């Protein structure tokens, strides 16, 4: 019965949709970007990529059993880490750059140390305890990491102890994505049940739940201000949710776009929204005007991952073609 | 690259590229096989005879050919979210137990449904399937003890192994909808070791030859 109460509470706050208020704002115009760097060397499908905090180094993971740290400026390969399992699904870069984490169909998450005295990359910790495939992971600090798995649950792990201190439960379907808030106090996850849930890291309990998607949610990302987030699903629509309002603001979709989103990201100011599609083309959407401002068609197979530098200078894209492209 | 300590970085990158290419050129000449089947389908026997908690990889060599087999039944998760990761495998191995009438979740019907779902999957349009029918010895006693009509009310053949096995094989092979695109290889598992590996090698060789003929434009 509480669902009806929640519906009544939410419907009363929607006096005017964000589309009506945005009618006064001028359009963003046309945005066009070109490929300045082509990162090659991977021989299989690439699944995950994450920009470093310095906005120069990035790490990408491929199903060939290798994840490479790339120097985005000179395109030089800094490290080549041979993995024990080639079925990777996600990768992450530590904020301090001291450690790198990756995982996939194996039910464990591996963390690698880059600043070893011997000079070679070595395994630091293997976080076991999950039963389903690892889906996503993001570092909070050098000693804390939050991971997602296909077991429909998320857990917080202490690398030093090597066990999950807290467990997050409540999702019906497998969790497909995870994103940390700017202050790291909260994080959100998307699941196959088409609902997005906000979880409290400190208390380890769900605070809010969001729905509206007609199919599985594949990607999720916070708005730079942290008061809203966007999700990507197989619906071929992007939906933005506001935490304080607890209601959807708008949905970005087009009749032409079959085979909906696979990845989502925001610019530094959040004016434009970048999403990766199964059409191996990345479409740039105006977060306020809800219009497509450009298309980064530079791949052949599929856009699996993409990310915007913390500085906002450039945006990198990954693909099943085994090549990465950086746009500006 | 002009400055010092930058040419050394370029040399390091070149060495990394050389190592990556050398590693890649070795994996390309390895046959990848996907292993499927229920927990009670008898998959463990195949690994046991070849060798004599997530994805499990088995490596073996037969007549100068290298094989890699991946078991995906270890982890329980949404299949459609990760099945595409195995796209491009040479062939798919499917295991079914003939005597799988002990419990009703009907396990034979579940196996048939799983076979239909995997065979007609979009990611495996051109991928052939190798079907292993295990527990023939137990099925020999089961057919005498219990009738085959218990699972197939429409069955009208004699209650004998020679007819029951053929009926099951025909029923399983009829599920595929794209016979012009792929072929199904059926083998009855035997206690002796050599038959299984030899059959797998023969199927792989036939698939390779047929693919080459198709590329040439003859097949």
């Amino acid at each position, epitope marked *: 019965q509480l669902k009806n109460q929640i519906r009544d509470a939410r419907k009363a706050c929607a006096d005017a949709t964000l589309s009506q208020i945005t009618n006064n704002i001028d359009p963003v115009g046309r945005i066009q970007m070109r490929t300045r760097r082509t990162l090659r060397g991977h021989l299989a499908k690439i699944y995950a990529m994450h920009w470093g905090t310095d906005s*120069r*180094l990035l790490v990408s993971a491929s199903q060939d059993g290798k994840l490479i740290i790339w*120097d985005s400026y*000179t395109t*030089n390969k*800094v*490290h080549a880490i041979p993995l024990r399992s080639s079925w990777v699904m996600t990768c992450a870069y530590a904020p301090s750059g001291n450690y790198v984490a990756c995982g996939g169909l194996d039910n464990i998450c591996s963390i690698y140390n880059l600043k070893t*005295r*011997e*000079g*070679n990359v070595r395994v630091s910790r293997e976080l076991a305890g999950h039963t389903g495939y690892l889906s996503c992971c993001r570092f909070l600090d050098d000693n804390q990491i939050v991971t997602s798995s296909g077991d429909t649950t998320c857990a917080l792990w202490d690398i030093e102890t090597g066990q999950q201190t807290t467990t997050f439960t409540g999702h019906t379907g497998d969790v497909m994505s995870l994103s940390l808030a700017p202050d790291t106090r909260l994080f959100v996850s998307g699941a196959c049940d088409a609902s997005a849930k906000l979880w409290d890291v400190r208390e380890g309990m769900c605070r809010q739940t969001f729905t509206g998607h007609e199919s599985d949610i594949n990607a999720i990302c916070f708005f730079p201000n942290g008061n809203a987030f966007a999700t990507g699903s197989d619906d071929a629509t992007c939906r933005l949710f506001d935490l304080r309002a607890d209601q959807e603001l708008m949905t970005y979709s087009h009749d032409n776009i079959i085979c909906g989103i696979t990845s989502v990201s925001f610019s530094k100011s959040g004016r434009l929204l970048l999403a990766g599609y199964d059409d191996f083309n990345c479409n740039v959407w105006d977060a306020l005007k809800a219009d497509r401002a450009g298309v980064l068609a530079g791949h052949d197979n599929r856009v699996s991952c993409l990310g915007v530098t913390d500085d906002g200078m450039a945006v990198a894209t990954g693909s099943w073609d085994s090549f990465l492209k950086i746009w500006n | 690259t*002009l*400055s*010092a*300590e*930058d*040419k*050394a*970085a370029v*040399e*390091r990158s070149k*060495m990394i590229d050389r190592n990556l290419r050398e590693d890649g050129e070795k994996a390309a000449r390895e046959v990848k096989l996907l292993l499927l089947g229920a927990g009670e389908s008898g998959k463990n026997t195949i690994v046991k005879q070849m060798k004599i908690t997530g994805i499990v990889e088995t490596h073996f060599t037969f007549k100068d050919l290298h094989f890699k087999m991946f078991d995906v039944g270890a982890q329980r998760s949404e299949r459609k979210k990760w099945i595409h990761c195995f796209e491009g495998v040479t062939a798919i191995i499917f295991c079914v137990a003939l005597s799988d009438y002990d419990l009703v979740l009907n396990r034979m019907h579940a196996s048939m449904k799983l076979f239909d779902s995997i065979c007609n999957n979009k990611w495996f349009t051109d991928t052939s399937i190798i079907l292993f029918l295990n527990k023939k010895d137990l099925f020999e006693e089961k057919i005498k003890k219990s009738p085959l009509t218990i699972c197939y009310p429409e069955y009208a053949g004699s209650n004998t192994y020679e007819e029951a096995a053929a009926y099951i094989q025909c029923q399983f092979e009829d599920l595929n909808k794209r016979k012009d695109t792929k072929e199904i290889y059926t083998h009855f598992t035997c206690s002796t070791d050599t038959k299984n590996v030899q059959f797998v090698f023969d199927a792989v060789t036939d698939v390779i030859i047929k693919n080459n003929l198709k590329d040439c434009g003859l097949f």
Partner: single-chain antibody
Amino acid sequence: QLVESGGGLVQPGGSRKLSCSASGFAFSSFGMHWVRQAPEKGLEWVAYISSGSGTIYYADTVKGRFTISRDDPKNTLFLQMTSLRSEDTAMYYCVRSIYYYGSSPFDFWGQGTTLTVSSSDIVMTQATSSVPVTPGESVSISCRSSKSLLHSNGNTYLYWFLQRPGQSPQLLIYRMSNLASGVPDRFSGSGSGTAFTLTISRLEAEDVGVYYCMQHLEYPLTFGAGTKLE
């Protein structure tokens, strides 16, 4: 750790072969340098070989007379010498180095060996030879170069080394702004263009030694005259 061997008494015009053994780290991925120190003078770079033996360099004073080679399987380094001269007498040190974005070259130095024989480059200038110091005081060391070390990419290739009495040189600051791992926070370095300085806060007896500056903008590598603190 690094241990060098091959020293002893040699006569002019003879031949000798130094050897160095490395363990505890991935020798194959680290480039090796040879640096020799005369018995009563400063440091002098000898030769360098990159990882994989793809590049080799020699100094003019020893070009053609010496030879450098690697045996990665055994983590061993060699330095063949021929036609030894009177000036070749010096203590030879093996130096570990690696080159990648964010790396710290010359971070480790070997113990070294003694060799005894009977009988356009960038110049690094240190104005002060000796500086009296006492515990608790702040001390500054000045350096200058005949050529600008600020490359177009923005990197300033200045290195600072400290050689305590009876000990081999140890890396202090690299690229003029980065403290080597394990170096106390007290040490700090800053500079611009052709002038550079090193500053120590709350100096202690452990800081006694000779401070050497080096440049890595281009070969050959040149060390400074060195400043003594006591």
